């Protein structure tokens, strides 16, 4: 299958070189897999989700996405036009309020909820969790991301947006999950992207077109936009039977585009997420 005039990020994860416009992907498209988006929620009713998204849990007064962030990240995972895995099942967990903020105890509660809730859903190809959030080091936030991963969910987290070593941010600094840096359309590290030894992989994160609230779309930048490229790719490869939740991050790093990125400081991986599609 091919999507012509795809957003640059989709095109980039199906190509060995930058500057193409076509997203080459197997027509299976993540059917049978589930991705939990733990964020500000999802506008489930966006025509771009085709009825494949629903809210399962909120920690606030409403389940509605009043922000747009969560809907953007959900769109890059599995919307029709803007998504990596175009036939995946999207579940929204709202741990962030409509200003994009949330206490660590609510974020911990949300990860433990997904570890339980996956057991009463139909996801034969497997479960991904996408966390486009973080702040300063907490051993509790890390420990909870480790519990979600250990329970059999592929966990993708944002490296963070401070142009700093990700080692001082959670859940970014938790070794056992998949920590995602951001690249731009010329194969440069996004100027805001965290780096360091703890990073596993880079995705597209600068000028990413995806879904937004009120049935709209817009372009935003961040490791928040890169993370769902990787969660999507993991759901996609799990549907193909090429890897499992336990080892998807390591399989994505093995099969990645090597050495193509610039402004990668010594000690950080030069690995860019790639689906390895052959028609």
Three-class DSSP labels, 53-76: EEEEEECCCCCCCCCCHHHHHHHH
The answer to whether the Cα torsion of 38, 7, 247, 260 is positive or negative is: negative
Q: Which is nearer to Na ion, 92 or 134 (CB)?
A: 134
**Considering the complex, what minimum distance in angstroms separates the CB of residue 177 from Na ion?**
6
- Binding site annotation covers 223? no
Alpha carbon distance, N-terminus to C-terminus of the chain:
8
Q: How many CB atoms lie within 10 A of CB 117?
A: 16
**In whole angstroms, what is the distance from residue 27 CA to residue 109 CA?**
36
- Binding site annotation covers 16? yes
Catalog residues that contact Na ion under the rule CB under 5 A: 16, 175, 200, 260
Residue pair 158/227 in contact (Cβ under 8 Å)? The answer is yes
**Considering the complex, what minimum distance in angstroms separates the CB of residue 12 from Na ion?**
11
**In whole angstroms, what is the distance from residue 73 CA to residue 71 CA?**
6
Q: Which is nearer to Na ion, 98 or 260 (CB)?
A: 260
Helix axes 223-239, 69-78, angle to 10 degrees: 30
Residue 56 has which token pair?
Answer: 């399962």
**Considering the complex, what minimum distance in angstroms separates the CB of residue 130 from Na ion?**
15
Please identify every residue annotated as catalytic.
39, 69, 224
**In whole angstroms, what is the distance from residue 93 CA to residue 53 CA?**
11
Q: Which is nearer to Na ion, 65 or 200 (CB)?
A: 200
Length of the chain: 279
CA-wise closest residue to 24 among 33, 15, 36, 32: 15
Residue 186 has which token pair?
Answer: 């010329």
- Binding site annotation covers 177? yes
**Considering the complex, what minimum distance in angstroms separates the CB of residue 80 from Na ion?**
28
Q: Which is nearer to Na ion, 13 or 44 (CB)?
A: 13
- Which residues are paired to 182 by β-bridges? 203
**Considering the complex, what minimum distance in angstroms separates the CB of residue 230 from Na ion?**
11
Q: Which is nearer to Na ion, 99 or 139 (CB)?
A: 139
- Binding site annotation covers 112? no
Residue 41 has which token pair?
Answer: 């929620």
Omega within 30 of 0 (cis) for the link into 171: yes
Q: Annotated binding residues for Ca(2+), as ranges?
A: 16, 175, 177, 200, 260
Q: Annotated binding residues, as ranges?
A: 16, 175, 177, 200, 260
């Amino acid at each position: 299958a091919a999507q012509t005039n795809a957003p640059w990020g989709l095109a980039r994860i199906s190509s060995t070189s930058p500057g193409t416009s076509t997203y080459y992907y197997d027509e299976s498209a993540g059917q049978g897999s589930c991705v939990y988006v733990i964020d500000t929620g999802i506008e489930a009713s966006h025509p771009e989700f085709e009825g494949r998204a629903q809210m399962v849990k909120t920690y606030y007064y409403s389940s509605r996405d009043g922000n747009g962030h969560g809907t953007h990240c959900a769109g890059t995972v599995g919307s029709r036009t803007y998504g990596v895995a175009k036939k995946t099942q999207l579940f929204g967990v709202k741990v962030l309020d409509d200003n994009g903020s949330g206490q660590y105890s609510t974020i911990i509660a949300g990860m433990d909820f997904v570890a339980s809730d996956k057991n009463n859903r139909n996801c034969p190809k497997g479960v991904v969790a996408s966390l486009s959030l973080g702040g300063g080091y907490s051993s509790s936030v890390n420990s909870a991301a480790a519990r979600l991963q250990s329970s059999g969910v592929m966990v993708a987290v944002a490296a963070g947006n401070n142009n700093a070593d990700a080692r001082n941010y959670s859940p970014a600094s938790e070794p056992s999950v998949c920590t995602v840096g951001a690249s731009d359309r010329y194969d440069r590290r996004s100027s805001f992207s965290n780096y360091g030894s703890v990073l596993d992989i880079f995705g597209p994160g600068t000028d990413i077109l995806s879904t937004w609230i009120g049935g709209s779309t817009r372009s935003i930048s961040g490791t928040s936009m890169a993370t769902p490229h990787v969660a999507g790719l993991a759901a996609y490869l799990m549907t193909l039977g090429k890897t499992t939740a336990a080892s998807a991050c390591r399989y994505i790093a093995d099969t990645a585009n090597k050495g193509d990125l610039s402004n990668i400081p010594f000690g950080t991986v030069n690995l860019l997420a790639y689906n390895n599609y052959q028609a």
